[PDB]
Amino acid sequence: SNEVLVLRGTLEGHNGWVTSLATSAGQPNLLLSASRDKTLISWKLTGDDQKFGVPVRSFKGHSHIVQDCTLTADGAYALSASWDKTLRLWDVATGETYQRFVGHKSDVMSVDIDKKASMIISGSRDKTIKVWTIKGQCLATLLGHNDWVSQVRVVPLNQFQIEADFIGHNSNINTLTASPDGTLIASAGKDGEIMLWNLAAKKAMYTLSAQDEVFSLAFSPNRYWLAAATATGIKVFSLDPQYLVDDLRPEFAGYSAAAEPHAVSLAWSADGQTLFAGYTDNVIRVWQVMT
Amino acid sequence: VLVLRGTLEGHNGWVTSLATSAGQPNLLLSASRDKTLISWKLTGDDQKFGVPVRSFKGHSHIVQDCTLTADGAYALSASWDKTLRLWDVATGETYQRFVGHKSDVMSVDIDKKASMIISGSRDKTIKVWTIKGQCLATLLGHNDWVSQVRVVPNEKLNQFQIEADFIGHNSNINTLTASPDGTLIASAGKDGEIMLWNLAAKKAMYTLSAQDEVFSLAFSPNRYWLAAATATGIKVFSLDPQYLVDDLRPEFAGYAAEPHAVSLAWSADGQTLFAGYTDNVIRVWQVM
């Protein structure tokens, strides 16, 4: 007896690939997206059809691709990673920058915040990790081995412990996500390999095959599901118990079976009831869970 | 009190580092600017305290730090040749090489499990290695911060985690030691400042003034003491209560600048203090 993901509409406004989506718990009606068009967009979500949402504010300043973005728990502040080797801290409401973070020398690929909002963990394309103060000061710079993936963390300035978990994963293509409770971590390999790893228990669990080159991963914050953006569609796996819940492929009426856009970013709703996917065609598509 | 018991004079350069083994009380290891390490047979005899037994000569420059496994079977050394070597203590031959540092290598430690090696560069870079010689992580803090990287014990190689503690210490000169029970850490600043820090309690304790440029620190394995090698001799502080237990300045002959200690090491049982000197000699105090 099964649930289902149902295509809800769409969200246009970007000119380039939608490379990252971000959600906020304090603001369920707010979505943040980053794009190769060098901007981020904040979205007012109405839940209508098909205008699921509508642009609110454009965030400009990055001189090149924005690869990653994230929101504070309250939705008040956004963080972005760019190919201009910079990170910016944004005022969500006013769309202006409060802090540049300079120092990475490879394209910047990921960003996260420690719950305390005190510090920022960023990730480079060469796999270099930097830990910053909210004031834009780089405190530590960490670089693991190529055949390893990691989870850099900041335990709760005169001082700070940082715990870094390393996990051997030979084929890894450096595409990671941590489970809501940060108890699980999914790591994408070659040919669609997705290795799952238990952090609290310190061992792998199994390896899934999304069967095609994985571009993005995102755990459900409510259910035991992992969504994987594939060149071929979005696969949503049930983790316990293991089944493949659904394979979200939209129709692209205007495209040939070959040149079909694909999802390159994923994000679940604060209530894990909505799945956002950013696409190779500049569009954000939205599924909802039904029965 | 500390009483000067003898001497160990086999080196041809500064004795830069001493190492002790719990599983082998009569074994001492030392490194020198003469590019070698020496293993020593300790007799306790009179000023023939110890006698050279081996001579590890693989490095092509100053060996700066060394350490022994808990059992005394294996030694690790750090060199200005930007390398680290793993040694068989008994046979004196290398079993693996650690290349990758590009600044002089200043410190080495082993995680209790013997699985991995933490090394420290002069440019304050920290590298975590597999016993097989493979660098797994490379970490570099801010200059005004000092750091104790630890390998977490899986507690059960594909997986491994590292907790790195950072402590603000502006004046710091990157001379650092940890309490045996990893609860405490002493960090040397300028003009002899020694900041003490409680790790388990995440905050400073106080700052001890040595009034003399420090070169080496070593906490006591049993007693709450911190020894500090100074340009004027070796200060041994009691930490609770705080007083200067002793200031060990040995006897040179004749009648300006005098040889000073640049390395320290307590025996496993805290009863003996070894200090390596600017005059190629290792001197030995015992508690009475």
Short mmCIF file of all heavy atoms in Angstrom, two decimals, chain B residues 87-137:
data_model
loop_
_atom_site.label_atom_id
_atom_site.label_comp_id
_atom_site.label_asym_id
_atom_site.label_seq_id
_atom_site.Cartn_x
_atom_site.Cartn_y
_atom_site.Cartn_z
N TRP B 87 60.61 3.14 12.20
CA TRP B 87 61.79 2.31 12.42
C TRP B 87 61.48 1.06 13.22
O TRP B 87 60.61 1.05 14.09
CB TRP B 87 62.85 3.10 13.18
CG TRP B 87 63.28 4.39 12.56
CD1 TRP B 87 62.66 5.60 12.68
CD2 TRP B 87 64.46 4.61 11.78
NE1 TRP B 87 63.38 6.56 12.00
CE2 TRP B 87 64.48 5.98 11.44
CE3 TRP B 87 65.48 3.78 11.33
CZ2 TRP B 87 65.50 6.54 10.67
CZ3 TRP B 87 66.49 4.34 10.56
CH2 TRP B 87 66.49 5.70 10.24
N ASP B 88 62.22 -0.01 12.94
CA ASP B 88 62.22 -1.17 13.80
C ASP B 88 63.27 -0.91 14.87
O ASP B 88 64.46 -0.81 14.58
CB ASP B 88 62.55 -2.44 13.02
CG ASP B 88 62.36 -3.70 13.84
OD1 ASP B 88 62.41 -3.62 15.08
OD2 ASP B 88 62.15 -4.78 13.23
N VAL B 89 62.82 -0.78 16.11
CA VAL B 89 63.71 -0.41 17.21
C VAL B 89 64.84 -1.41 17.39
O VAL B 89 65.99 -1.03 17.62
CB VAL B 89 62.92 -0.26 18.53
CG1 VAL B 89 63.86 -0.35 19.72
CG2 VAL B 89 62.14 1.06 18.53
N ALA B 90 64.51 -2.70 17.27
CA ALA B 90 65.48 -3.76 17.51
C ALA B 90 66.56 -3.84 16.42
O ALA B 90 67.74 -4.02 16.73
CB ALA B 90 64.76 -5.10 17.64
N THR B 91 66.16 -3.70 15.17
CA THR B 91 67.09 -3.88 14.05
C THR B 91 67.62 -2.57 13.48
O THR B 91 68.55 -2.57 12.68
CB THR B 91 66.44 -4.67 12.89
OG1 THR B 91 65.51 -3.83 12.19
CG2 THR B 91 65.72 -5.90 13.41
N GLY B 92 67.02 -1.46 13.88
CA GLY B 92 67.46 -0.15 13.44
C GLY B 92 67.19 0.17 11.97
O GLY B 92 67.75 1.13 11.45
N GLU B 93 66.35 -0.62 11.31
CA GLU B 93 66.07 -0.35 9.90
C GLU B 93 64.66 0.18 9.65
O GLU B 93 63.72 -0.15 10.37
CB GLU B 93 66.36 -1.56 9.01
CG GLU B 93 65.63 -2.84 9.37
CD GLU B 93 65.92 -3.96 8.39
OE1 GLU B 93 66.15 -3.66 7.20
OE2 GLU B 93 65.93 -5.14 8.80
N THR B 94 64.53 1.01 8.62
CA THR B 94 63.24 1.60 8.27
C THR B 94 62.29 0.57 7.69
O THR B 94 62.71 -0.38 7.03
CB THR B 94 63.41 2.76 7.27
OG1 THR B 94 64.30 3.74 7.81
CG2 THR B 94 62.07 3.40 6.97
N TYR B 95 61.00 0.76 7.93
CA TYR B 95 59.97 -0.15 7.42
C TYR B 95 58.98 0.59 6.54
O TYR B 95 58.12 -0.02 5.90
CB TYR B 95 59.24 -0.83 8.58
CG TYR B 95 59.92 -2.09 9.08
CD1 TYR B 95 61.26 -2.34 8.78
CD2 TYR B 95 59.23 -3.02 9.84
CE1 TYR B 95 61.88 -3.49 9.23
CE2 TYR B 95 59.85 -4.17 10.29
CZ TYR B 95 61.18 -4.40 9.99
OH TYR B 95 61.80 -5.54 10.44
N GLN B 96 59.09 1.92 6.51
CA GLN B 96 58.20 2.75 5.70
C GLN B 96 58.65 4.20 5.71
O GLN B 96 59.24 4.68 6.69
CB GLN B 96 56.76 2.64 6.21
CG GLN B 96 55.78 3.55 5.50
CD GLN B 96 55.36 3.01 4.15
OE1 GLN B 96 55.04 1.83 4.01
NE2 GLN B 96 55.34 3.88 3.14
N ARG B 97 58.37 4.91 4.62
CA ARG B 97 58.75 6.31 4.50
C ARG B 97 57.52 7.21 4.38
O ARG B 97 56.53 6.83 3.76
CB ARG B 97 59.67 6.52 3.30
CG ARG B 97 61.13 6.75 3.66
CD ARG B 97 61.98 6.96 2.42
NE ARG B 97 62.12 8.37 2.08
CZ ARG B 97 62.58 8.81 0.92
NH1 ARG B 97 62.96 7.95 -0.02
NH2 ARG B 97 62.67 10.12 0.69
N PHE B 98 57.60 8.39 4.97
CA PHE B 98 56.50 9.35 4.93
C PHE B 98 56.90 10.63 4.21
O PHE B 98 57.48 11.53 4.80
CB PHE B 98 56.02 9.67 6.35
CG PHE B 98 55.54 8.47 7.12
CD1 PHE B 98 56.44 7.63 7.75
CD2 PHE B 98 54.19 8.19 7.22
CE1 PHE B 98 56.01 6.53 8.46
CE2 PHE B 98 53.75 7.09 7.92
CZ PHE B 98 54.66 6.26 8.54
N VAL B 99 56.58 10.69 2.92
CA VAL B 99 56.90 11.86 2.11
C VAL B 99 55.65 12.63 1.73
O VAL B 99 54.60 12.04 1.46
CB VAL B 99 57.67 11.47 0.83
CG1 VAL B 99 58.67 10.36 1.13
CG2 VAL B 99 56.69 11.04 -0.25
N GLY B 100 55.75 13.96 1.69
CA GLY B 100 54.63 14.81 1.34
C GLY B 100 54.68 16.19 1.97
O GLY B 100 54.23 17.16 1.37
N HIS B 101 55.20 16.28 3.19
CA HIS B 101 55.40 17.58 3.82
C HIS B 101 56.34 18.37 2.92
O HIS B 101 57.25 17.79 2.31
CB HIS B 101 55.98 17.44 5.23
CG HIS B 101 54.95 17.32 6.32
ND1 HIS B 101 54.06 18.33 6.61
CD2 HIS B 101 54.69 16.32 7.19
CE1 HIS B 101 53.28 17.95 7.61
NE2 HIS B 101 53.65 16.73 7.99
N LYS B 102 56.14 19.68 2.83
CA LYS B 102 57.05 20.51 2.05
C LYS B 102 57.73 21.57 2.92
O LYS B 102 58.53 22.38 2.44
CB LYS B 102 56.35 21.13 0.84
CG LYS B 102 54.97 21.70 1.11
CD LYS B 102 54.29 22.09 -0.20
CE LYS B 102 53.08 22.97 0.04
NZ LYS B 102 52.38 23.32 -1.23
N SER B 103 57.41 21.55 4.20
CA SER B 103 58.12 22.35 5.19
C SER B 103 58.81 21.38 6.14
O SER B 103 58.45 20.20 6.18
CB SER B 103 57.15 23.24 5.95
OG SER B 103 57.82 24.03 6.91
N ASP B 104 59.81 21.86 6.88
CA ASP B 104 60.52 20.98 7.80
C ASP B 104 59.54 20.29 8.74
O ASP B 104 58.62 20.91 9.25
CB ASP B 104 61.56 21.77 8.59
CG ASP B 104 62.71 22.25 7.73
OD1 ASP B 104 63.00 21.60 6.71
OD2 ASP B 104 63.33 23.29 8.06
N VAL B 105 59.72 18.99 8.97
CA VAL B 105 58.83 18.25 9.85
C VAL B 105 59.27 18.36 11.31
O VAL B 105 60.38 17.97 11.66
CB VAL B 105 58.76 16.77 9.45
CG1 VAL B 105 57.66 16.06 10.23
CG2 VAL B 105 58.51 16.65 7.97
N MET B 106 58.36 18.85 12.16
CA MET B 106 58.70 19.25 13.53
C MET B 106 58.17 18.33 14.64
O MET B 106 58.71 18.32 15.75
CB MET B 106 58.21 20.68 13.78
CG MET B 106 58.91 21.73 12.93
SD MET B 106 60.68 21.83 13.32
CE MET B 106 61.34 22.33 11.73
N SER B 107 57.13 17.55 14.36
CA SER B 107 56.56 16.70 15.41
C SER B 107 55.86 15.46 14.87
O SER B 107 55.35 15.45 13.76
CB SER B 107 55.60 17.51 16.28
OG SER B 107 54.60 18.10 15.47
N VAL B 108 55.84 14.41 15.68
CA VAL B 108 55.19 13.16 15.33
C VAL B 108 54.50 12.55 16.54
O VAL B 108 55.00 12.60 17.66
CB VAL B 108 56.19 12.10 14.84
CG1 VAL B 108 56.87 12.55 13.57
CG2 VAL B 108 57.21 11.80 15.93
N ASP B 109 53.34 11.94 16.29
CA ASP B 109 52.67 11.15 17.30
C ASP B 109 51.96 9.98 16.67
O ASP B 109 51.78 9.92 15.45
CB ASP B 109 51.70 12.01 18.10
CG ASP B 109 52.29 12.50 19.40
OD1 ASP B 109 52.47 11.68 20.32
OD2 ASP B 109 52.59 13.72 19.50
N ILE B 110 51.56 9.03 17.51
CA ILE B 110 50.81 7.87 17.07
C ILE B 110 49.48 7.85 17.80
O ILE B 110 49.42 8.19 18.98
CB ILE B 110 51.55 6.58 17.44
CG1 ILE B 110 53.03 6.72 17.11
CG2 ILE B 110 50.94 5.38 16.73
CD1 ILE B 110 53.85 5.52 17.51
N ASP B 111 48.41 7.47 17.10
CA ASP B 111 47.15 7.21 17.78
C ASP B 111 47.34 5.89 18.50
O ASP B 111 48.03 5.00 18.00
CB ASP B 111 45.99 7.12 16.79
CG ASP B 111 45.93 5.78 16.08
OD1 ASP B 111 46.96 5.33 15.55
OD2 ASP B 111 44.83 5.18 16.06
N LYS B 112 46.76 5.77 19.69
CA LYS B 112 46.98 4.59 20.52
C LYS B 112 46.90 3.29 19.73
O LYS B 112 47.70 2.38 19.94
CB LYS B 112 46.02 4.57 21.71
CG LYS B 112 46.51 5.34 22.93
CD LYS B 112 45.83 4.82 24.18
CE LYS B 112 45.85 3.30 24.20
NZ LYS B 112 44.92 2.71 25.19
N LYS B 113 45.94 3.20 18.81
CA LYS B 113 45.73 1.98 18.03
C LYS B 113 46.91 1.59 17.14
O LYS B 113 46.91 0.50 16.56
CB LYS B 113 44.46 2.09 17.18
CG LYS B 113 43.19 1.62 17.87
CD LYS B 113 42.01 1.60 16.91
CE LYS B 113 40.77 1.03 17.58
NZ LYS B 113 39.56 1.11 16.71
N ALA B 114 47.89 2.47 17.02
CA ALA B 114 49.04 2.25 16.14
C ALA B 114 48.63 2.28 14.67
O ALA B 114 49.43 2.00 13.78
CB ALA B 114 49.73 0.93 16.48
N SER B 115 47.38 2.63 14.41
CA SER B 115 46.85 2.62 13.04
C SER B 115 47.33 3.81 12.21
O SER B 115 47.62 3.66 11.03
CB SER B 115 45.32 2.58 13.06
OG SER B 115 44.79 3.69 13.76
N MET B 116 47.43 4.98 12.83
CA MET B 116 47.72 6.19 12.08
C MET B 116 48.70 7.13 12.77
O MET B 116 48.86 7.09 13.99
CB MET B 116 46.43 6.95 11.80
CG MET B 116 45.31 6.11 11.22
SD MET B 116 44.06 7.17 10.50
CE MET B 116 44.87 7.59 8.96
N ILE B 117 49.30 8.00 11.97
CA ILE B 117 50.36 8.88 12.44
C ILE B 117 49.97 10.35 12.22
O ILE B 117 49.61 10.73 11.11
CB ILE B 117 51.69 8.56 11.70
CG1 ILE B 117 52.24 7.23 12.20
CG2 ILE B 117 52.72 9.65 11.89
CD1 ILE B 117 53.27 6.64 11.30
N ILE B 118 50.02 11.15 13.27
CA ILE B 118 49.87 12.60 13.12
C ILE B 118 51.23 13.28 13.12
O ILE B 118 52.03 13.09 14.04
CB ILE B 118 48.98 13.23 14.21
CG1 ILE B 118 47.58 12.62 14.21
CG2 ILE B 118 48.88 14.73 13.98
CD1 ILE B 118 47.48 11.27 14.88
N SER B 119 51.49 14.07 12.09
CA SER B 119 52.76 14.78 11.97
C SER B 119 52.52 16.29 11.91
O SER B 119 51.43 16.74 11.57
CB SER B 119 53.55 14.29 10.75
OG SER B 119 53.03 14.82 9.54
N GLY B 120 53.54 17.06 12.27
CA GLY B 120 53.42 18.50 12.31
C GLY B 120 54.60 19.19 11.65
O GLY B 120 55.75 18.86 11.91
N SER B 121 54.29 20.15 10.79
CA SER B 121 55.31 20.86 10.04
C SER B 121 55.70 22.19 10.72
O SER B 121 55.00 22.65 11.63
CB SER B 121 54.82 21.12 8.62
OG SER B 121 55.82 21.74 7.83
N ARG B 122 56.82 22.77 10.30
CA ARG B 122 57.28 24.06 10.81
C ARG B 122 56.33 25.15 10.36
O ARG B 122 56.12 26.13 11.09
CB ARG B 122 58.70 24.37 10.32
CG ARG B 122 59.07 25.84 10.34
CD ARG B 122 60.55 26.02 10.02
NE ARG B 122 61.38 25.77 11.20
CZ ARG B 122 62.54 25.13 11.18
NH1 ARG B 122 63.04 24.65 10.05
NH2 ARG B 122 63.20 24.95 12.32
N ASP B 123 55.74 24.99 9.18
CA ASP B 123 54.72 25.93 8.71
C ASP B 123 53.38 25.60 9.32
O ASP B 123 52.33 25.97 8.79
CB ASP B 123 54.60 25.97 7.17
CG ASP B 123 54.26 24.62 6.57
OD1 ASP B 123 53.97 23.68 7.33
OD2 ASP B 123 54.28 24.50 5.32
N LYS B 124 53.41 24.87 10.42
CA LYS B 124 52.20 24.60 11.19
C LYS B 124 51.12 23.75 10.50
O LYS B 124 49.98 23.69 10.95
CB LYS B 124 51.58 25.92 11.64
CG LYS B 124 51.94 26.31 13.05
CD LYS B 124 50.97 27.36 13.57
CE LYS B 124 51.69 28.36 14.47
NZ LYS B 124 50.81 28.80 15.57
N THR B 125 51.50 23.09 9.40
CA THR B 125 50.63 22.15 8.72
C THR B 125 50.63 20.80 9.42
O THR B 125 51.67 20.34 9.91
CB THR B 125 51.07 21.94 7.28
OG1 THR B 125 50.80 23.12 6.51
CG2 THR B 125 50.32 20.80 6.68
N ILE B 126 49.46 20.17 9.48
CA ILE B 126 49.28 18.89 10.15
C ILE B 126 48.81 17.84 9.16
O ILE B 126 47.84 18.05 8.44
CB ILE B 126 48.21 18.99 11.24
CG1 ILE B 126 48.56 20.11 12.22
CG2 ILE B 126 48.05 17.64 11.95
CD1 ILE B 126 47.65 20.15 13.41
N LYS B 127 49.50 16.70 9.14
CA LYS B 127 49.18 15.62 8.22
C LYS B 127 48.94 14.30 8.93
O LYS B 127 49.74 13.83 9.72
CB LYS B 127 50.27 15.44 7.17
CG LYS B 127 50.41 16.56 6.19
CD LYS B 127 51.32 16.17 5.05
CE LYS B 127 51.16 17.07 3.84
NZ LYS B 127 51.21 16.30 2.56
N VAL B 128 47.82 13.70 8.61
CA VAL B 128 47.44 12.41 9.15
C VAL B 128 47.77 11.27 8.18
O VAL B 128 47.28 11.25 7.05
CB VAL B 128 45.95 12.38 9.48
CG1 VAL B 128 45.58 11.01 10.01
CG2 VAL B 128 45.62 13.48 10.48
N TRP B 129 48.58 10.32 8.62
CA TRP B 129 49.06 9.27 7.73
C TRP B 129 48.57 7.89 8.15
O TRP B 129 48.27 7.65 9.32
CB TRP B 129 50.58 9.23 7.70
CG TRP B 129 51.27 10.54 7.50
CD1 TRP B 129 51.40 11.55 8.41
CD2 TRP B 129 51.97 10.97 6.33
NE1 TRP B 129 52.11 12.59 7.87
CE2 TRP B 129 52.48 12.25 6.59
CE3 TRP B 129 52.20 10.39 5.08
CZ2 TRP B 129 53.21 12.97 5.65
CZ3 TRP B 129 52.93 11.10 4.15
CH2 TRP B 129 53.42 12.38 4.44
N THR B 130 48.52 6.98 7.19
CA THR B 130 48.31 5.58 7.50
C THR B 130 49.68 4.98 7.78
O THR B 130 50.69 5.46 7.29
CB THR B 130 47.67 4.82 6.33
OG1 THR B 130 48.52 4.89 5.19
CG2 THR B 130 46.29 5.40 6.01
N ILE B 131 49.70 3.92 8.58
CA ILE B 131 50.96 3.29 8.94
C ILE B 131 51.65 2.82 7.68
O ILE B 131 52.85 2.59 7.70
CB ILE B 131 50.75 2.09 9.89
CG1 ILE B 131 52.09 1.61 10.46
CG2 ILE B 131 50.00 0.98 9.16
CD1 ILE B 131 52.80 2.65 11.30
N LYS B 132 50.90 2.69 6.59
CA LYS B 132 51.47 2.26 5.32
C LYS B 132 52.14 3.39 4.52
O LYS B 132 52.66 3.19 3.43
CB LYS B 132 50.40 1.57 4.47
CG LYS B 132 50.37 0.07 4.63
CD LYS B 132 51.75 -0.51 4.37
CE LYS B 132 51.67 -1.90 3.79
NZ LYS B 132 53.00 -2.37 3.33
N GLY B 133 52.12 4.59 5.08
CA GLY B 133 52.79 5.72 4.48
C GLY B 133 51.91 6.60 3.62
O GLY B 133 52.42 7.45 2.90
N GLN B 134 50.59 6.41 3.70
CA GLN B 134 49.66 7.18 2.87
C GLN B 134 49.03 8.35 3.62
O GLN B 134 48.36 8.16 4.64
CB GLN B 134 48.57 6.27 2.30
CG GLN B 134 47.80 6.90 1.15
CD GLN B 134 46.55 6.12 0.78
OE1 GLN B 134 46.14 5.21 1.50
NE2 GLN B 134 45.94 6.48 -0.34
N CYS B 135 49.23 9.56 3.10
CA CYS B 135 48.65 10.75 3.71
C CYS B 135 47.17 10.81 3.40
O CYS B 135 46.77 10.85 2.24
CB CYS B 135 49.34 12.01 3.19
SG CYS B 135 48.62 13.53 3.84
N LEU B 136 46.36 10.83 4.46
CA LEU B 136 44.90 10.78 4.33
C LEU B 136 44.24 12.14 4.47
O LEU B 136 43.26 12.43 3.79
CB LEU B 136 44.31 9.82 5.36
CG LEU B 136 44.50 8.34 5.06
CD1 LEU B 136 43.48 7.52 5.83
CD2 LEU B 136 44.35 8.10 3.58
N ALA B 137 44.77 12.97 5.36
CA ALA B 137 44.22 14.31 5.54
C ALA B 137 45.34 15.30 5.78
O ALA B 137 46.38 14.95 6.34
CB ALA B 137 43.24 14.33 6.69
#
